[model samples]
Target chain A: AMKVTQLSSETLDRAHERFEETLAQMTVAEANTMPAPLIKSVTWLMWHTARELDLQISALNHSDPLWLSQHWTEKFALDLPDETEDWHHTPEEAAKVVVAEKQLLSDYLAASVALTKSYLDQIKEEQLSDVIDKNWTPPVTRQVRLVSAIDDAVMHSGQAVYTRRLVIGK
Target chain B: AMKVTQLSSETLDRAHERFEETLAQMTVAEANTMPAPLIKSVTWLMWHTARELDLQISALNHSDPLWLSQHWTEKFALDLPDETEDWHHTPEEAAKVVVAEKQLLSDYLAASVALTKSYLDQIKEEQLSDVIDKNWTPPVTRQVRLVSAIDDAVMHSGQAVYTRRLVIGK
Candidate 1:
């Protein structure tokens, strides 16, 4: 029942390992530093990736996102709206995303990864082909949604690694 | 006829698009810049990722890698030995990987990606379950190698994006 689920969960574990390694070597100031105008800080990258996974997976499960139920927004306490999708954030918007403490970012990321693993662990292989969205021409299947979430997580985690090296010169 | 092929192909496309976008913005100097001593430059990242995909997928298919038959080594003219595995290179070795022109990096990346898609296009879904490597405890399946190759490509492509923004501030 968990064949495909195991693949994604393993993938997420690899992504999280890289993410944590980068986070472990970063300071609060380093995490918040924007090395360039267009590039996002480590804090913003970690937060957005976690939020993206939380919202997307929650939608697929027909349940409220952990971002809302788990009160991640209040914990984050940024000036931005809770409904904000940080994926499309402008450079100005990206720079405005600052975290006072590194643990807050790490906590949200850990919670999001755990919740995603929980869902993936229980998902049946047959459910992968189940259509969840018909708006697109090909119709978005559960598998597609899952892949999208994992892909974003993996991409951002690598970005966080590169950003850390840039900010900390390590 | 086509099940896993479409997913991996589509994923590769997305990964290559980001890779191209990042490569387009980099200058030769920026491509060669290692932001930190331990961190690799954009050039090394792109080249190493392409080499990784070419080598791994080639082995899975029981064919010679494009790195050899396609004369990619001659094209790159890198100072390292052609047999050198770029994955475990030290910082000194990584910094030695410099490209004179951006097109060299892009061309190699494009060629390697095309070769990967060609393999994916012809692979049968049933073949994914066929275990190819028995070195690992659980044995490595074709699906796992395919996923690993493409996942690394996607992760590194995103790193190139972050590196470009850091080096060029664009």
Candidate 2:
């Protein structure tokens, strides 16, 4: 019931809404397009957004990511490997992330967001300070990791909105 | 120390980073150009980004926004009025938001973000729930308002990144 938890849940939900609204406006071909040479495919952005939340939350829980545990890779049928450092995906790597249907991309995104919402609902305010990673000079806390994951989704969601306009017209 | 408040500051800071980095790569004309019809000028995005933070944080503090309080309006010399509904600025309206120097836009955004960062650092947890608005059915808390302002900055900041690549070929 903490306001911060609600804020996290709402922030994450807004990102999903943007991704969904943009995807709703595009054809599957549009979703899969690079739109421009430097701009990535909406397909890749949504896929990576899903994996980020899933991977980060899984690490927090010391559990397998929903992508693995729930077999989203099989559903996605992505040609990429399991451990693809999606954040660092090159243009060549990104173009390979095409999907057969827009639904597959949106569906996986939905599941990933659901996982994050559940996690947010249960976390206490004190847990926000828990150091989830210690490899850095100051270490990374749960709040830092959560904020980064949510912010990545927000960033990529806007790109998809722009990418949709590029491929399919606003 | 409230984690939510720190999250607000970091999130807003990241948005500023994206806006500043994109502006650094562009000329004043490039920043002023609409990369695409559907996509807005980075000028509009950064201007609106600054105004959103300034307006919302100013409201929370019951003071004039930095746009008015700190004379950013005079510095930028924007043609738009003090009451310009920036969130609803049409393509034509957004186009008129042009600046002579990319520095003007970046400077205003920096000042606006600094205002939000200062506000975030001083807010307590209980203050987050202080109802800032009752116009909606559910009412609005300080937390909801702060998160919205930061998220909007994050959203448009990403758009500016795409707009930069679209205008200047990355």
lDDT scores in order: 0.80, 0.83
Error of 2 at B156 (Å): 1.0
lDDT of 2: 0.83
| Ten residues in sequence with the least summed lDDT for candidate 2 chain A | A1-10
Task: Point out where model 2 deviates above 4 Å.
Answer: A1-4, A84-87, A121-138, B1-3, B84-87, B124-138
Compose the digit string of candidate 1's lDDT tens values, residues B17-105.
88778777777888899877766788988888888888988888888888888887887787887654535788888888998898988
Candidate 1's C-alpha runs over 4 A off are A1-9, A27-29, A84-87, A90-104, A114-146, B1-6, B27-39, B84-87, B118-144
DockQ numbers for every candidate? Answer: 0.36, 0.55
Q: What are the per-residue Cα lDDT tens digits for candidate 2 across A1-170?
A: 35566766777777899899888888888889997678998998999899889998888878889898989889888777876454577778789989988888888889999988888887777898898779998999998888788788888888888888888877
* Model 2 lDDT tens row, B1-170: 36556665776677788888888888889989996667999998998889889998888988888888888889888776777454576777778888888878878888888888888888777898888789997999888898788778898888889999889987
Model 1's DockQ score = 0.36
